[PDB]
UniProtKB/Swiss-Prot annotation, chain A:
Quaternary structure annotation from Swiss-Prot or TrEMBL: Interacts with capsid protein VP0, and capsid protein VP3 to form heterotrimeric protomers. Five protomers subsequently associate to form pentamers which serve as building blocks for the capsid. Interacts with capsid protein VP2, capsid protein VP3 and capsid protein VP4 following cleavage of capsid protein VP0. Interacts with human PVR.
Domain of life: Viruses
Protein purpose: Forms an icosahedral capsid of pseudo T=3 symmetry with capsid proteins VP2 and VP3. The capsid is 300 Angstroms in diameter, composed of 60 copies of each capsid protein and enclosing the viral positive strand RNA genome. Capsid protein VP1 mainly forms the vertices of the capsid. Capsid protein VP1 interacts with host cell receptor PVR to provide virion attachment to target host epithelial cells.
Subcellular location: Virion; Host cytoplasm
Name recorded for this polypeptide: Capsid protein VP1
Species assigned in the record: Poliovirus type 1 (strain Mahoney)
Residues of the whole record sequence present: 647 to 865 of 2209
Length: 207, 146, 114
């Protein structure tokens, strides 16, 4: 037999990096004193059609995450004033911790939240998150309620990603976008199910 | 925690024809055409699918997936001209090693007519289907009073 | 069961022990001691009632007892027939004593007096 089944394996079928979100931040002008924008996004796969649809083939799952960040920037007005190099703080808030609510706040200080400091113009930043969960596997479908006479189908908690620019305001407003590329790793699945059609999918098992 | 053994039987004569499919869906999250705790738990009375209250869609199995693919789930076929009994031995399936039974339903059992019922003239116009469930390897912890 | 060879169905034969009033619904009888008799592959059903009493003997004629148990037959399932076959069947019953029965204290009261 000169044909192998090694390209349909679970790792081959799933472990591929795809963009999951685009987070916008900016460093405003030092003249106008409006608040500096910061980005917050909760980790969830229910916004990428392809990854979700490939996950709904099964009901129980386990995997680690590999996250990469691609940062780009641009001036947003025709001014001769320029800016120096920029450094970005990319904070990962594990599942269960408070989320930032203002750009300057103790949440960008806690020793518990691990951060990355990335200087513009260098190789993209990368990290790996392990399997974080209280059960022995994620559950895409859950026939249960939180309270019995309450939500019908548990939701999975992965963490949060917050992003800001460490530099203080320049005299020039510069806007930046960070694209997050996620890659599941060491994945295992259980109990296959029939796949759903492309009907925009849905928030739950509702249709 | 516990497993189950389900035995389905159909009483039919040699002049009846039709086919049934029995499917054992793990974590059978259903949906109607909009749920509450009253809909997902109808009790021993059970519920009924429907075609084109809370009544999922038969050809979608109530969860948006086509009926034809439903054979990925553990299943059996009762063809009246070959056999009229089916048996499924369901082990315990859950992400946790043990869980609260009062809030969580491990399995769902669905019975769907693949080929409608027909019979010779003047026969019995409707035949009975019986379910018999036996728990296996049960065990409980955290005993309260009463 | 003295019905047709082409009939099919199920009956529930339940035994209620002494001191318990008779069951009135098939579900109540199902939770007790019972047997499902399948009309279609067996023509006769046997049920042995054991010996239960505080004393070693019991009086043949007694009043206010209102116990001893009951035997009941319930429709577990309807009866299905293939064709114009008659839908009315008959069943007969027979009773006997096992090899551990006994009696004592002979009493005779037969009299033709007027």
């Amino acid at each position: 037999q000169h044909r192998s089944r090694s390209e349909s394996s679970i790792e081959s079928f799933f472990a591929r990096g795809a963009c999951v979100t685009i987070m916008t931040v900016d460093n405003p002008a030092s003249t106008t004193n409006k608040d500096k924008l910061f980005a917050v996004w909760k980790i969830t796969y229910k916004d990428t059609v392809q990854l979700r649809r490939k996950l709904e083939f099964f009901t129980y799952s386990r995997f680690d995450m590999e996250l990469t960040f691609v940062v780009t920037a641009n001036f947003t007005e025709t001014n001769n004033g320029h800016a120096l190099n920029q450094v970005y703080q990319i904070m990962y808030v594990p599942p269960g911790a408070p989320v930032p609510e203002k750009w300057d706040d103790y949440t960008w200080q806690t020793s518990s939240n691990p951060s990355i400091f990335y200087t513009y113009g260098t190789a993209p930043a990368r990290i790996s998150v392990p399997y974080v969960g209280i059960s022995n596997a994620y559950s895409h479908f859950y026939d249960g309620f939180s309270k019995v006479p309450s939500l019908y189908g548990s939701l999975n908690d992965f963490g949060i990603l917050a992003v800001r620019v460490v530099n203080d305001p320049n005299p020039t407003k510069v806007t930046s976008k960070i694209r997050v590329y996620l890659k599941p790793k060491h994945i295992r699945v259980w109990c296959p199910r029939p796949p759903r059609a492309v009907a925009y999918y849905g928030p739950g098992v509702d249709y | 925690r516990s497993g189950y053994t389900v035995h389905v039987q159909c009483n039919a004569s040699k002049f009846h024809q039709g086919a049934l499919g029995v499917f054992a869906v793990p974590e059978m999250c259903l949906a109607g055409d909009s749920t509450s705790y009253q809909n997902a738990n109808p009790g021993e009375k059970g519920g009924t699918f429907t075609g084109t209250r809370f009544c999922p869609v038969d050809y979608l199995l109530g969860n948006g997936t086509l009926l034809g693919n439903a054979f990925v789930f553990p299943h059996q076929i009762i063809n009246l001209r070959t056999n009229n009994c089916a048996t499924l031995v369901l082990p315990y399936v859950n992400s946790l090693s043990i869980d609260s039974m009062v809030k969580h339903n491990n399995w769902g059992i669905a019975i769907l007519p693949l080929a409608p019922l027909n019979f010779a003239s003047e026969s019995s116009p409707e035949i009975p289907i019986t379910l018999t469930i036996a728990p296996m390897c049960c065990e409980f912890n955290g005993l309260r009073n009463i | 069961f003295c019905g047709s060879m082409m009939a099919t169905g199920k009956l529930l034969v339940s035994y209620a022990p002494p001191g318990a009033d008779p069951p009135k619904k098939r579900k109540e009888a199902m939770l007790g001691t019972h047997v499902i008799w399948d009309i279609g592959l067996q023509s006769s059903c046997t049920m042995v009632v054991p010996w239960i009493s505080n004393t070693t003997y019991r009086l043949t004629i007694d009043d206010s007892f209102t116990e001893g148990g009951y035997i009941s037959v319930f429709y577990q399932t309807r009866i299905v027939v293939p064709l114009s076959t008659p839908r009315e069947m008959d069943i007969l019953g027979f009773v006997s004593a096992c090899n551990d029965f006994s009696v004592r204290l002979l009493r005779d009261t037969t009299h033709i007096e007027q």
